[PDB]
Amino acid sequence: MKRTFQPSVLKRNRSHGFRARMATKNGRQVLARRRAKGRARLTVSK
Amino acid sequence: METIAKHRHARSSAQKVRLVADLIRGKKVSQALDILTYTNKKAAVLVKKVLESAIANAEHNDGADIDDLKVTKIFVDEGPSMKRIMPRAKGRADRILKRTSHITVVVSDR
Amino acid sequence: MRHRKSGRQLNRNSSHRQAMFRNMAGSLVRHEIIKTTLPKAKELRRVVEPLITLAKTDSVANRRLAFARTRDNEIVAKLFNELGPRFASRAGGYTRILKCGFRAGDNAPMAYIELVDRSE
Amino acid sequence: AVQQNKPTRSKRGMRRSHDALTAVTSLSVDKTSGEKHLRHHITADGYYRGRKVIAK
RNA sequence: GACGACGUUGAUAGGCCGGGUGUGUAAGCGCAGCGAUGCGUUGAGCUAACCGGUACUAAUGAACCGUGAGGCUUAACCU
RNA sequence: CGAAGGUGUGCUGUGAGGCAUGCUGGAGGUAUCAGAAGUGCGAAUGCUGACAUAAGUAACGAUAAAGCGGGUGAAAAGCCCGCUCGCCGGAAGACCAAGGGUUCCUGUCCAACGUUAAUCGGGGCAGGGUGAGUCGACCCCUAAGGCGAGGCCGAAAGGCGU
RNA sequence: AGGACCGAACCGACUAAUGUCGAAAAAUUAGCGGAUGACUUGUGGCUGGGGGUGAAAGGCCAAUCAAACCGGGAGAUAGCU
RNA sequence: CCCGGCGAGGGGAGUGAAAAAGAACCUGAAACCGUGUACGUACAAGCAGUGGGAGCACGCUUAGGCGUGUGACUGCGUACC
RNA sequence: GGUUAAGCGACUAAGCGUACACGGUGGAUGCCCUGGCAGUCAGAGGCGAUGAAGGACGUGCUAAUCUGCGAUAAGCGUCGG
């Protein structure tokens, strides 16, 4: 079947990327919670 | 004088090695080598490779006599498991556990 | 229910079955011995013994007859050209089956087929 | 296809009363070579009723 | 798995010769036709399991489990 | 010259228990009398770890197809070669973008992985290989569209936008 | 010329089978409807939970939809096991 | 050092207080799984126990008979929450 | 002593049951700590455009990862202990 995750890096980057999530203040809290919860991989990097 | 040989973690199950190592209970060695050279199985690859290693432990460490040399006890006992995951249908898995077994061969002159 | 039938199926379709027994009988006379399982040994016999039967009384037409059933003239070259005086007197069987033993691959009853007259 | 009440290890044993491997003790000795093969079979060195039958 | 037939004092299987059966005029030559093809050879040839024989090959000497006159008591017959 | 714990044993109390002791064990335990509670488990389709059962049953993943000889090797229906057989051929062929990121290749190894064995493998150990003024991007130019200097607008964030 | 005809690709899902502890959390073989249109596909964007979007089935919104999912109120509450 | 596939695994030897401390390593219970010895068992049915009990097998005392194991057969008896 | 009959009658155990001795899997119990929770007591109560918190990629004799550090890279100078 046409399964749901038909992936890319172009869909991925402009949605869940760094400068996307660290654009707005509501995004920024996720970057300031993934920090404080001590996650290694912040959002997506290659 | 008495001697023991063990193959530990033989990659099979207990009933698979119990069946051929039921015939060689209470036998002499040369009739046991001849009943294991022509038993068409995998455990007869297993324990006959080890039963000849037991008589080596006689001719070298214990009693060099092999002609009138008995096998007293032989008992295959269980071992660990390799718990892999098998996929069954409709999304649900299946905890397979690839079985493993231990065999002792005990050789002496009662 | 098999009652008075013959010719074991050997778990292949008839088209596959016939085409194997060609390329074993082609292989049989070229190396003079084959290892097979017991039934194929027991039923390559019922197939090959026509060939050296229909090759003692040599003709022009029987060359194609052992080419319609063989389609391998190199095997037909060994027939009729050595096998003639090799088998003048044997009114009947030409295979001495040997029960060899057991296949260490998959526990088959292995065996040995040969032509009787062996000196090499 | 299901079990409703698990059988004991007793009846599990008596089902295994007949699994025992048939012994193949009936070896043979050669006529004129003296060695030992299995009956109606050939040796490791190609002997069968005192003949080098396969020469392997 | 059992039951049955045999194991060189052998026809139990396979092969083989023959017959039987089934399909129909094999192939290869020669003739008639520019040719497809038709005629002769030729009711030929080929023929699964069928039937009757022939030991040609495969069914070996052994080895093996099974023993070594069968308990007690009474009655009836042996002397 | 042997603590707790474990495992049997003889005794003892109305029971919850206690006391002595054989073996295993190898460094801690605790009387009498009192103080405080994460204080006593069979259940709750309780949670977690482990092990049975069905069972040596079912199944081995398309009904394209094998068969033979040789070799390597401790062992070969499956690995390497040769010989035929069979299957695909607007594909089960060969290139590219996406997407995966050593999965390619030689030496070497079989514990584990490969729904089997395995000398083989897209598996592990080790080393190697990707070479562009023209190929694609990066780069110069915009669409849909997202931000958005001044600004308009809005409790605050922020929304729209040149 | 055709929202024209026949029929592959592409697409869709009608009928039966099989499967339904599946080879698959919706498939495979045999057919079936269309196939220059109101079509089909790729890539890149925009819309948002009482809100999106809908040739309207309460269908679809990451296998879940008569109000998605994560966290937070919150150890809600439970005359009920 | 022997045997094995110059594998795994294992038996000796050596260290060490001990390898029934060996890298899956202190201690190592239970379920589950086998080995051996002893007894019962293939005409008997049924919550599988309890009351009675022959024979056999053993540790012993003291030789009179207890203890432990099994337990033919028999009287009652339909698990727990 | 032998013979026919009649009555009665163990050892057989493919496996299975129970108890002991033996390990087999298993990793609970007792014991252990450089691990963590709750606080007493002072001190601090900030880091940040002479570039942060949190990361990427490099640095050694080195393959890798952790600690430290940053083309001066497990470290430099400097004044002391």
PDB file of C-alpha atoms (C1' of nucleotides) in Angstrom, chain G residues 19-45:
ATOM      1  C1'   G G  19      -6.579 -15.531   2.627  1.00  0.00           C
ATOM      2  C1'   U G  20      -8.595 -13.857   6.953  1.00  0.00           C
ATOM      3  C1'   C G  21      -2.900 -16.860  14.494  1.00  0.00           C
ATOM      4  C1'   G G  22      -2.885 -13.635   6.186  1.00  0.00           C
ATOM      5  C1'   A G  23       2.927 -13.732   1.682  1.00  0.00           C
ATOM      6  C1'   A G  24      -0.483  -8.364   3.189  1.00  0.00           C
ATOM      7  C1'   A G  25      -3.395  -4.404  10.014  1.00  0.00           C
ATOM      8  C1'   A G  26      -7.166  -4.950   2.913  1.00  0.00           C
ATOM      9  C1'   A G  27      -3.883  -8.373  -0.647  1.00  0.00           C
ATOM     10  C1'   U G  28      -3.007 -12.297  -4.861  1.00  0.00           C
ATOM     11  C1'   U G  29      -5.152 -15.385  -9.676  1.00  0.00           C
ATOM     12  C1'   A G  30      -9.663 -15.226 -13.181  1.00  0.00           C
ATOM     13  C1'   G G  31     -12.233 -12.033 -15.289  1.00  0.00           C
ATOM     14  C1'   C G  32     -14.658  -6.145 -14.781  1.00  0.00           C
ATOM     15  C1'   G G  33     -15.344   0.173 -15.646  1.00  0.00           C
ATOM     16  C1'   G G  34     -12.934   3.930 -18.081  1.00  0.00           C
ATOM     17  C1'   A G  35      -8.579   5.207 -20.992  1.00  0.00           C
ATOM     18  C1'   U G  36      -7.517  13.174 -24.860  1.00  0.00           C
ATOM     19  C1'   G G  37     -10.906  14.098 -20.117  1.00  0.00           C
ATOM     20  C1'   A G  38     -14.898  17.215 -15.099  1.00  0.00           C
ATOM     21  C1'   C G  39      -8.944  12.845 -16.266  1.00  0.00           C
ATOM     22  C1'   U G  40      -3.789  10.897 -14.461  1.00  0.00           C
ATOM     23  C1'   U G  41       1.236  11.529 -12.133  1.00  0.00           C
ATOM     24  C1'   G G  42       5.745  13.967 -10.115  1.00  0.00           C
ATOM     25  C1'   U G  43       7.890  17.891  -7.476  1.00  0.00           C
ATOM     26  C1'   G G  44       7.376  22.707  -4.319  1.00  0.00           C
ATOM     27  C1'   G G  45       3.802  25.337  -1.276  1.00  0.00           C
TER      28        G G  45
END
